[PDB]
Design a protein around this ligand. Structure first.
Ligand SMILES: CC(C)(COP(=O)(O)OP(=O)(O)OC[C@H]1O[C@@H](n2cnc3c(N)ncnc32)[C@H](O)[C@@H]1OP(=O)(O)O)[C@@H](O)C(=O)NCCC(=O)NCCS
Ligand SMILES: CC(C)(COP(=O)(O)OP(=O)(O)OC[C@H]1O[C@@H](n2cnc3c(N)ncnc32)[C@H](O)[C@@H]1OP(=O)(O)O)[C@@H](O)C(=O)NCCC(=O)NCCS
Lengths: 376, 376
């Protein structure tokens, strides 16, 4: 009777940028090539990011039409909203349609909708827009999770667990849709942490169907959501902040963000897995939000993870970059697809128990304990 | 085993405005006294609003320091954010402290926090700020409900029901905190619907403790949350919209908003109460979001409600105005207090079953079915 993931799909905007080409493109389109040292610093950030490509619905053409978006602090929120508020549900609809097709049931059986984005707020919200675009029932029970940043891919699983398990027959559609329209901006030699965001953030959407008590004749379980926790890390106030301003969403990142997450992550593992009798962190499958490669590297080092535990998470980071809440859902899709292709015994890389982590502002750690499903 | 409201408290900023004096004050502080006809129109709106007073943390002094807030469309989002993002959790903390005192248990027993506001978004959110201000456990499970407008006082009860009932031992703190900092603006003879907002919107916060399985030795039930639904009204797209812009939160209201809600409300009553065997809408106690007096008047007329059914809802509207999500929680507090004072048989005006309605963008109707508790 646990909430069960029944289908997962993803979508990205067509427009792609090769990370190796990005420092030249970025410093040219923002008219900052005279910033020779800052460009080389950005080059190092992009090289160290461990990202091969990123999708961005923002094109050279759109940026030329909105030049204040290319300044560091140009007045541009209205322009960003005009673009993003249409894009967020549109990209989410692409992912949702594919998830519903995989699931194979009529959309009239979707009783709940969770929509999640940090790319722009509006009233009514992206949940309303998606409900109308998909033609969901007017009576769909909606939860709109706005502006919760990079841990929210786990938040929506924590939410979906309680919705589906407390409501017999319920089926929840989850949609996360994120993009760089509010955060893209030109460079500043007094805002290096803003450059880090320019090296990492990307567009993407993911959609899931979740329900308790699957009908084995028509539905196929992929993961079970066993537990979901959330905690704030000690002494971490101010380490990640994002402010919605006249210049868009400004991003503020302290250098010891990776150290906070790696220094505290084992406590979440202990609290989540000791009650189950589990203590070997290499004996569980891992989905870790790739907020940056340094978070994943330092967690790996601190815990002594074998070097392939984080392969699925690093693969999504490499092929898609930091798509905020969407990343962990992309990673679940990657792992179950790869396990089916490679003939593994379970959707969790042949292991039975797994952990999914969201990392973001607070500092907040979201810890979800999963069970895999056998692949017969 | 139903989610049960165990404590309710409210808070308002000290600064109060008498509605009879507001047209003169408003047209003076916005430098618009030459708008003689528009001022009289605003006078009629304030007279017809059925509001006696409103609380607003915004003072003449603060508005003088932020003159772009007094224009109709002056660039002012940064100024509004600077004020509102501090005020929202501060006013919420005042209500939360009082609710926790009423409840009487240690704040370490609060396992979940729902924070709700449409007065300003930030990362981390007001839930984070409140957790630190109150000293809740770092492991409190937080849900941040941003920008869902006037139906969200019911949304948080719908959310709290599933959180508490799916988690044994859980106790949820709900805080709604709303204010006029993002919406206050000067008048425009081409934006009459914006004037309607200036006549109606107000500041306030409410806080509740909710939990299933109350401990009768230490806790006192006030209401049980039996069911919670949400629906979009047919052909209503665009009737209420709110946009987060460089000039703040702009408000857009069609004239037939009251007709949409009154024409469709009985369907929600039918769906919610027919399965319980209830059809007499005068036989249940009522909590109705006072989005404007015309909504309450037209619902009353359409359904044939006796003229005192909406007394508690109209009382809160009169003494506090439209505080968005906080209103329905103020009304629950008023009704249980009044019923205790007047010696009624139940916290629901002596009736056993009750309905609580949230109204807002979509158009969305939130329908919560309540049970009262006997007063011995
Ligand atoms: C950004 C990142 C990929 C850079 O990788 P790295 O080069 O191996 O790490 P380094 O310490 O060598 O950083 C290289 C340079 O960027 C600077 N830098 C990195 N993070 C920075 C930050 N948050 N603020 C300011 N400068 C920063 C470093 O100081 C260094 O500058 P310098 O060589 O001129 O002295 C890596 O630091 C990372 O993944 N950080 C976590 C990112 C994060 O916070 N994600 C959450 C976003 S919501
Ligand atoms: C605003 C309100 C109190 C006015 O009460 P009322 O005077 O009895 O109703 P009226 O139709 O006579 O309105 C008076 C005037 O305001 C105008 N008006 C009212 N609502 C308006 C709107 N949404 N847009 C533009 N004008 C509006 C009317 O046209 C009328 O102007 P006029 O006399 O010069 O022709 C009442 O209409 C109400 O409660 N409306 C619902 C408010 C609402 O939408 N709340 C949700 C906010 S999120």
């Amino acid at each position: 009777g646990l909430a069960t993931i029944l289908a997962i799909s993803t979508a990205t905007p067509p427009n792609c940028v090769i990370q190796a080409d990005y420092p030249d493109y970025y410093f040219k389109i923002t008219n900052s090539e005279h910033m020779t040292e800052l460009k080389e610093k950005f080059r190092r950030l992009c090289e160290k990011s461990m990202i091969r490509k990123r999708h961005m619905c923002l094109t050279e053409e759109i940026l030329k039409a909105n030049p204040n978006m290319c300044l560091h602090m140009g007045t541009s929120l209205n322009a960003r909203q005009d673009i993003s508020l249409v894009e967020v549900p549109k990209l989410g609809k692409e992912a949702a349609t594919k998830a519903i097709k995989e699931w194979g049931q009529p959309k009239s059986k979707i009783t709940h909708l969770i929509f999640c984005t940090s790319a722009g707020v509006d009233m009514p919200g992206a949940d309303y827009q998606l409900t109308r675009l998909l033609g969901l029932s007017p009576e769909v029970k909606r939860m709109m999770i706005y502006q919760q940043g990079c841990y929210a891919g786990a938040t929506v699983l924590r939410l979906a667990k309680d919705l589906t398990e407390n409501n017999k027959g319920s089926r929840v559609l989850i949609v996360c849709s994120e993009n760089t329209v509010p955060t893209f901006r030109g460079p500043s030699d007094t805002h290096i942490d803003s450059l880090v965001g320019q090296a990492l953030f990307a567009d993407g959407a993911a959609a899931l169907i979740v329900g308790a008590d699957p009908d084995a004749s028509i539905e196929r379980p992929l993961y079970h959501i066993v537990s979901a926790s959330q905690t704030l890390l000690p002494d971490s106030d101010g380490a990640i902040e994002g402010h919605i301003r006249e210049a868009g969403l400004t991003v503020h990142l302290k250098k010891d963000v990776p150290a906070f997450f790696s220094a505290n992550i084992e406590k979440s593992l202990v609290d989540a897995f000791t009650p189950i009798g589990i203590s070997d962190w290499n004996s569980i499958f891992w989905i870790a939000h790739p907020g940056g490669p340094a978070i994943l590297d330092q967690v790996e080092e601190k815990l002594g993870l074998r070097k392939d535990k984080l392969k699925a998470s690093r693969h999504v980071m490499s092929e898609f970059g930091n798509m905020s809440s969407a990343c962990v859902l992309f990673i679940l899709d990657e792992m179950r697809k790869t396990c089916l292709e490679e003939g593994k015994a379970t959707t969790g890389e042949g292991l039975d128990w797994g952990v999914l982590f969201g990392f973001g502002p607070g500092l907040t750690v979201e810890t979800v304990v999963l069970r895999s499903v056998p692949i017969e």
